[PDB]
Design a protein around this ligand. Structure first.
Ligand code: 1XK
Ligand code: 1XK
Ligand code: HFG
Ligand code: HFG
Lengths: 478, 480
């Protein structure tokens, strides 16, 4: 049973929810966690969605090695990578790192494979795990030392084609969150200080966690331009015979998405899993003395529902009371519970309870499959709409810096007109950190949203008083 | 490809996998890049196997890639890769990259399993593992990092665990025979060849005629209660008594792709069985001197739509910057089962010319007949690839009765099926003797498996090596 209340002790609530729902197991190596089937099935669902979509775009999957040579990674202080230095008791002549990302593994191959315009575009993806051995405190799903992800890497003859792909991928990430996970996200461009330094422009989808007021980056898609093509000599002869640099993109999204989903939809009773990704969509709980009447009808119902492609489990485990099973599956977040006891059997009905609201329905056995499909569609949409309402309520539009600290104290983000000077972003981070100290606490840019309201002529930047350029979203962050 | 498969087999294999764009080389020895053309086949067999194990109630999971020194070694270290530093700082205790996940998963199993209500526990994961052997690698077959799936189950009874071992082994037979069209032999490993941590190891074995070697294709172990004792995986039964779980584990890797390549490839390159071909039919418009360009391209689009309506996986190669002859050779070296050519004449005739990759046979087919006729041809290709490979397997196994027949059979690049007493001392002696005789003429012959399909053992039959009473017919040969 979940005892910590989500609004009062959010961090303990999160730990309880992910452990008692059987999503994670702890491990002796800090920063690494076991992903149990209840969570892994959600990853499998989003992976299938995204993989099907990128295949429609002509992206093909591949698999590159998990190791990169020291001289290829460092193309005098090491990055925060895990170094393999020995095989058995024998030192390697040159240490090798576990991939933190695969640019330095893939791009030498791209340089070999690309020789002429005929070879472009080149569009590859891989599903793997990466390792980033940061010394800070980990958080399951959200910030871990090893994590599962997909990384896409493309090369094109023109920047326009590369940018088109950047935006198509970002739209797929919006769909991953909004359509599969029912989590609303905001598409935007990263500031110069926050973008990937190896690239030209970084686009992002950002999510908001109301309980701690923090934004979190949900996925990323980069227009790399020609920087990496210069560094790796990825050149092609054009249709007229001149050597040119390719224009590249890269993009990724991780199991952080599951953590965002958990935090968005969970409640005081535990998880709430959107029907589109739930391992089990309907749990059948026989109200049981096993004559065979009740479980016979349950097996018939499960067969029937599975013909409608509903993911069903009958919980016929012994020595647990019905109420125990009800709470067990509520903590796990199954979106629908189907109760079948003796009175139900006598009437030819079943009692269906939806997890998000607790509303109960008496449904005849015949109406079961269509009514349950309808209810799952309603649950999915209601989860999304309520989360989107909370997102809207969490963003305050401001004009001057003196509004910032009140908004941050309300656990809100701010949308502010900004001159986009990177010096000013560093100054704002320092000032908000120190104001929080006197009163991390730093506010930073989350993104410059694609959806720009008009910028009235003469609008001043909320911090510098210089002419504002764009409306920018700021907040405390992960 | 220019090397002949029947002359320089290793060189043929390297040319086949490079020129088909299946692999790319890499600067760290023993690791290779799996390019999209190879990864497509992997995706097909992964989907088959994952669908089937899900039907059995096995659920996917993901455990960490790292194992602490004290948990792995629960002296001289094993052939694992050791992480010793994060950045410039030494780890307080070094950690290994997984070579397999027993030591990572089983402490969790011990925590999770409390009563019979928790059993059976059936988990699988798709991942890569690392085995840092000092020997020469071979792409797909023997590499230092490789992709695989490892399944690990726990049961209340040995009977249930053994039933699962055999169900999984049958899935591996289907992975090879139904998907890859590679015939395999199910069997039990000898005492000297089985997984030491388990009670009985079952296997599927394939045969490579060009070098006379058996190769283990996949494995499924009855672990019994050994790991349950080691990791304290116990459960309370219905009577309230504490008992040990009965476990299984099982795995299969991208070695399967290399076995497919070696089995079906020919002097022209790869031959992909239709059931694992991401492109089953390639349509090639013959464009020359601007003769009917628009008509030909429109018709190719129509044909692709029609064939896709029949679930045939079709690609039109309308790339303007390659000639038709180049396209012919490209898709042939890549092993696409069927090539469909449509030129000006064919547009006039209402026909298309189709060539099958395995035999080269050509067919003129009316556009209306295309879908059913191509389905029929793909069934024929899949069946023929399997049947020819099975005939080669049959021809490569000699039944023997005495050790004096062994060296002539090995020199014919064959396996031997011999009656054996099953004494491990005798397997060790046979390995040494056959290596020595080979040297005089690696060359050691070992057991590959004791097949499930046992012919009768006539009373009084003597072991082919020791002269003691034979127990079972055993398959032996040179091996990978
Ligand atoms: C699961 C995951 C996802 C992502 N990212 C980033 C990119 C993105 C965006 O969505 C996606 C690929 C594109 C994503 O998912 C980043 C990390 C991560 O930085 N891990 C290392 C680590 C370990 C640790 F023990 C502690 C901390 C730590 C503690 N405090 N701070 C400030 C850091 C960090 N981890
Ligand atoms: C791809 C793959 C698959 C399997 N196995 C084994 C089990 C099985 C059976 O099918 C499946 C999981 C159950 C499978 O696929 C074993 C290896 C492997 O031993 N790698 C290490 C290595 C690296 C290296 F550079 C050289 C050598 C080397 C050279 N000569 N010798 C005698 C060894 C070995 N590799
Ligand atoms: O990983 C990236 C850039 C992009 N790679 C492709 C997938 C999407 C992703 O945003 C940025 N990044 C992030 N963290 C890193 C940590 C280390 Br350690 C190293 Cl060496 C390198 C990096 C590093 O390059
Ligand atoms: O890996 C195994 C046994 C089984 N594990 C589950 C998947 C199927 C597989 O056959 C045997 N094995 C093989 N090679 C190994 C190499 C090293 Br290095 C280590 Cl430490 C351990 C092992 C080791 O245990």
């Amino acid at each position: 049973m979940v005892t910590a209340k989500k609004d009062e002790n959010f961090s303990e609530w999160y730990t309880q929810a992910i452990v008692r729902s059987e999503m994670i197991e702890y491990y002796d190596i800090s920063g690494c966690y076991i992903m149990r089937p209840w969570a892994f099935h959600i990853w499998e669902k989003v992976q299938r969605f995204f993989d099907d979509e990128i295949k429609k775009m002509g992206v093909e999957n591949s698999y590159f090695p998990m190791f990169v040579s020291r001289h290829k990674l460092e193309k005098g202080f090491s990055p925060e990578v895990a170094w393999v230095t020995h095989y058995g008791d024998s030192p390697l002549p040159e240490k090798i790192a576990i991939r933190p990302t695969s640019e330095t593994i893939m791009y030498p191959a791209y340089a070999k494979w690309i020789r002429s315009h005929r070879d472009l575009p080149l569009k590859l993806n891989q599903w793997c795990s990466v390792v980033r051995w940061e010394f800070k405190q980990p958080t399951p799903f959200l910030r871990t030392r090893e994590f599962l992800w997909q990384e896409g890497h493309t090369a094109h003859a023109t920047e326009e084609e590369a940018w088109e792909l950047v935006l198509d991928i970002l739209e797929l990430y919006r769909r991953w969150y909004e359509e599969c996970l029912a989590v609303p996200v905001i598409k935007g461009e990263k500031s110069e200080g926050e973008k990937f330094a190896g690239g030209k422009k970084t686009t992002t989808v950002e999510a908001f966690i109301p309980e701690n007021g923090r934004g979190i980056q949900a996925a990323t898609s980069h227009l790399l331009g020609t920087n990496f093509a210069k560094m790796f000599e990825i050149e092609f002869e054009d249709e007229e015979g001149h050597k040119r640099l390719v224009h590249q993109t890269s993009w990724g999204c991780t199991t952080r998405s599951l953590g965002v989903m958990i935090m968005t939809h969970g409640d005081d009773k535990g998880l709430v899993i959107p029907p589109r990704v739930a391992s089990v969509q309907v749990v059948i709980i026989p109200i049981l003395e096993n004559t065979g009447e009740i479980l016979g009808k349950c097996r018939e119902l499960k067969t029937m529902l599975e013909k409608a492609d509903i993911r069903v489990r009958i919980d016929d485990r012994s020595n647990y009371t019905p109420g125990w099973k009800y709470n067990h599956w509520e903590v796990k977040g199954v979106p629908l519970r189907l109760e079948l006891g003796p009175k139900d059997l006598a009437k030819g009905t079943a009692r269906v309870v939806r997890r998000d609201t607790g509303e109960a329905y008496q449904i005849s056995w015949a109406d079961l499959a269509p009514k349950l499909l309808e209810l799952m569609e309603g649950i999915q949409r209601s989860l999304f709409e309520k989360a989107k309402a909370r997102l809207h309520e969490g963003i305050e539009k401001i004009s001057t810096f003196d509004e910032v600290m009140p908004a941050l104290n309300r656990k809100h983000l701010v949308l502010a007109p900004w001159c986009e000077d990177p010096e000013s972003e560093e100054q704002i981070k320092k000032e908000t950190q120190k104001l929080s100290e006197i009163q991390t606490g730093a506010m930073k840019t989350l993104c410059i949203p694609f959806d720009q309201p008009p910028m009235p002529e003469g609008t001043k930047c909320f911090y510098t008083g210089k002419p504002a350029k764009r409306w920018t979203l700021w907040g405390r962050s992960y």
